[PDB]
Design brief:
- It is classed as transferase/transferase inhibitor.
- The entry lists the keywords GTA, cisab mutant, manganese, secreted.
- It forms a dimeric assembly.
- The entry is titled "Crystal structure of the Fucosylgalactoside alpha N-acetylgalactosaminyltransferase (GTA, cisAB mutant L266G, G268A) in complex with a novel UDP-GalNAc derived inhibitor (3GW and 4GW)".
- Two copies of one chain form a homodimer.
- In chain A, 27% of the residues lie in helices and 17% in strands.
- Chain A is of the alpha/beta class.
- In chain A, the strands form two sheets. In chain A, strands 1-9-7-8-5-2-3-4 form an eight-stranded mixed sheet, covered by helices on one side.
- The first copy, chain A, is globular, with a radius of gyration of 19 Å.
- Chain A has a single domain, classed as Spore Coat Polysaccharide Biosynthesis Protein SpsA, Chain A.
- The interface between A and B is large, with 62 and 60 residues.
- The complex binds ligand 3GW, ligand 4GW and manganese (II) ion (2 copies).
Chain lengths: 288, 288
């Protein structure tokens, strides 16, 4: 459940936080709307685990494995078992056009997987974009009654390190690894005013990656519904956003500020970007 | 109201947040449980004002003016008019044993004041401690119907700079100005195991000041009720905590982590502690 009130922790022994000696001095760790930006060194996972376990938190994880991308499922799921929300209840939701191709993966206690059969669109743009419609639809059918939070990610990825309850919050986006150091004018937002995803050059906080977002079920339902609706308006007007669902996600999170932002530790591509000093951990990374 | 969902902001023009060049490098701006610590330079008040105004947020502000402390009310209230939550709905609650002694203070639009007549305890220790019972009682009687958030402060104070919606959150405490740079062994927690407020030398995040705490009405009701009950247990056991209600506030916020923590900008004594470089603003300060 998502508790109505603050929970009561047991006695715990850990290092005193140091008001005058912040660990991360190299990166911004809070947004201008006072949302934490989650980097290694900003959180004590023992405190956060207690808080979330005391609420018997269930996390749903959606992933789309359409056409040849079913190949990615085995590593994705096996690494999620090692690194994603270990100790908490997890419900995996695998959307696929090939239920029989979902690999048999052994799950730890309190963890379950459901296979959702869906349509395979012809164009990769449509496969990517239609995820918003499909997640939104399933928030109603399944997720609202089954999980507390939803985490929505790309499948061509593996977990290499801890991804845990530090990410959970009503609404979150993740800094795209290609743009975390970039100026807003360089962000590849949709720039045509004819598109619902339009963001002009003097607006923008961050460029969020389409491959990792989430929040409470109700906030994810609202976001995915809104993005789908915007995409449908664009389609009726004969326009397709430059970065598809990611463009609409960015317009959405611009106007609806996320309550946490994840650092690129949570969405990385080591082949393209290496391992910069600013990344103390690489947690969720692209597979070739 | 307190909105159920994230609100939608209009287009806004402001400086881009800089992921790789944080403004505050001299202080901790997030706790290990990912609560913001509120300092000047961490927030854009225009964004926050929009978010809170779109929810028609009403803020209650409680102050006790018992016996001779009625003398502090004029300056407290006149300065609150200049600096506290300007632009938002405010409801002042003045708890006093002398209703006729409450000074006439002209209020801005959307701001009102209620005088709550209460008993004056003989011992100043009880006057201070009984605030918890009294706040809790009125949460049920008045506050739940009248305001969205409660801010509970000492009256022997004046506002000198902005105190606004950046502080609002389900539950907050404020860093006591005498200890923000101190080690937890130097915190003046209650150290006797016999007391409900007991905190041993190897525990504690911060030393919070009893003169400024708050949160949603429901969380403040729970905190004040719990602190009152703990004080009543101590009383039955023949014990009185070293710093009274503040000792119990500290025990409560140790086990129920606040969702924001305010820096000592929000609780300062300039005569006693001067004006360290780390304080860019002095917002709410002691009166001689
Ligand atoms: C690590 C990284 O930076 N990922 C980014 C990067 O992701 P990406 O290029 O690897 O996109 P993907 O190939 O993974 O497609 C997105 C997701 O959509 C699903 N998908 C995608 C596809 C295809 C996408 C492009 C194709 C080329 O013909 S096929 C597919 O055939 N079947 C399928 O199930 C799958 O879950 C996949 O992970 O670029 C996107 C925008 O398009 C985002 O910016 C994203 O954050
Ligand atoms: O003679 C010693 C006293 C200590 C507190 C007293 C008191 C406090 N109060 C309230 O408790 C708050 C805390 O007491 P304080 O400001 O004197 O405490 P400190 O700032 O010294 O910690 C005050 O701000 C008032 O709101 C009163 O209303 N009337 C009082 O007579 S009187
Ligand atoms: Mn991908
Ligand atoms: Mn005082």
């Amino acid at each position: 459940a998502i508790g109505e009130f603050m929970v009561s922790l047991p006695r715990m022994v850990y290092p005193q936080p140091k008001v005058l000696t912040p660990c991360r001095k190299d990166v911004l760790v809070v947004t201008p709307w006072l949302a934490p930006i989650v980097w290694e060194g900003t959180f004590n996972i023992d405190i956060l685990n207690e808080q979330f376990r005391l609420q018997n938190t269930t996390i749903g994880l959606t992933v789309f494995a359409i056409k040849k991308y079913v190949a990615f499922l085995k590593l994705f799921l096996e690494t999620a078992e090692k690194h994603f929300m270990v100790g908490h209840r997890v419900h995996y939701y695998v959307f696929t056009d090939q239920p029989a191709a979902v690999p048999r993966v052994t799950l730890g206690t309190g963890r379950q997987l459901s296979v959702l059969e869906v349509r395979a669109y012809k164009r990769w743009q449509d496969v990517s974009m239609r995820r918003m419609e499909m997640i939104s639809d399933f928030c109603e059918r399944r997720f609202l009654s089954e999980v507390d939070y939803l985490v929505c990610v790309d499948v061509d990825m593996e977990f290499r390190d801890h991804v845990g309850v530090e990410i959970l919050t009503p609404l979150f986006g993740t800094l795209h690894p290609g743009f975390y150091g970039s100026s807003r004018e360089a962000f590849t937002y949709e720039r045509r005013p004819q598109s619902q995803a339009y963001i002009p050059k003097d607006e923008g906080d961050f460029y969020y990656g389409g491959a990792f977002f989430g929040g409470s079920v109700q906030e994810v339902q609202r976001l995915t519904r809104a993005c789908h609706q915007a995409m449908m308006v664009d389609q009726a007007n004969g326009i397709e956003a430059v970065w598809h669902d990611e463009s609409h996600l960015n317009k959405y999170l611009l106007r609806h500020k996320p309550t946490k932002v994840l650092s690129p530790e949570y969405l990385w591509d080591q082949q393209l970007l290496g391992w910069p000093a600013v990344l103390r951990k690489l947690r969720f990374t692209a597979v070739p």
